[PDB]
Design a protein around this nucleic acid. Structure first.
Length: 48
RNA sequence: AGCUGGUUCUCCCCGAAAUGCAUUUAGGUGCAGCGUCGUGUGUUUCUUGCCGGAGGUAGAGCACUGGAU
């Protein structure tokens, strides 16, 4: 009983993965946002 | 701008590198080394004992070459 209502929909577990917000706080992808310090790759992309 | 600075909430698990080659190359980067996660394998890793191997260092020596009372 109590049929499917639109507030009962949930995705299959593992379907949706929360984004990775780099640059917020130091207990996460911190100040460098996973880049290191002062290289060509600390500001730019190196072509393959 | 191969350059300088800045990049904001939390906790749980693991956790390095500053080495090799090459480089209009040396404070940069490519590959390899070292980290992590997923998947397959499952003791293959590592330590100690024993066994089979090649050597030319420490030491020693003058048989070769050289030095030398």
């Amino acid at each position: 009983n109590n049929p499917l209502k639109i507030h009962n929909l949930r995705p299959a577990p593992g379907a949706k993965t929360a984004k990775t917000r780099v640059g917020r706080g130091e207990a996460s992808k911190g100040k460098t946002a996973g880049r290191g310090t002062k290289g060509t790759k600390a500001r730019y992309q190196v072509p393959e």
